[PDB]
Amino acid sequence: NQNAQALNTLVKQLSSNFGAISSVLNDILSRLDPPEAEVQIDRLITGRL
Amino acid sequence: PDPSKPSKRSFIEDLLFNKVTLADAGFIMQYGDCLGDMAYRDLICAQKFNGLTVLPPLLTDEMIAQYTSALLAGTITSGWTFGAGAALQIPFAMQMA
């Protein structure tokens, strides 16, 4: 049960915003320009790491 | 192990598996060969939507059961002699003595 709960929590954490405009990289790229989105992408990567 | 059953699984393991809440909607053919006493949906590929691969264990349950049966048979027949060297047959009634 603990292993399953940890795996499930790790899976749902992928959808965490971490203070960004959106939790999906594709949405960020489409709505927002790449160069300014670099900070948001870096923050999301840091949170996931 | 029961010689008649195709799978060499002891009665205790069968009861342990049975004591968990299972489902009756359909046919009980295999219903979980590795799960820890439950019956679930499709294999890890069903749950792997982000590449969360689950590497199969090196040792299979059949091998673990064979090891347990061999150790139990050695204990009944060879007693503790096989663990300290070559197996030495001896009646069980004389082992408890």
């Binding site: 499930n8 899976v11 | 792997k48 939507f49 982000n50 590449g51 691969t53």
Partner: protein, 48 residues
């Protein structure tokens, strides 16, 4: 119902706007490679 979800928080069931049908979603491989190599002194053949 139009869209579907799953415990993985990823779309699983969808509805085709053209015709009323249900199409499931599942990945094929996602990729994973292992290499088996014996002792290089004897031979260098490898298995994928």
């Amino acid at each position: 119902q139009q869209f579907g979800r799953d415990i993985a928080d990823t779309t699983d069931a969808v509805r085709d706007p053209q015709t009323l049908e249900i199409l499931d979603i599942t990945p094929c491989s996602f990729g994973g490679v292992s290499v088996i190599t014996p002792g290089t002194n004897t031979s260098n053949q490898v298995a994928v």
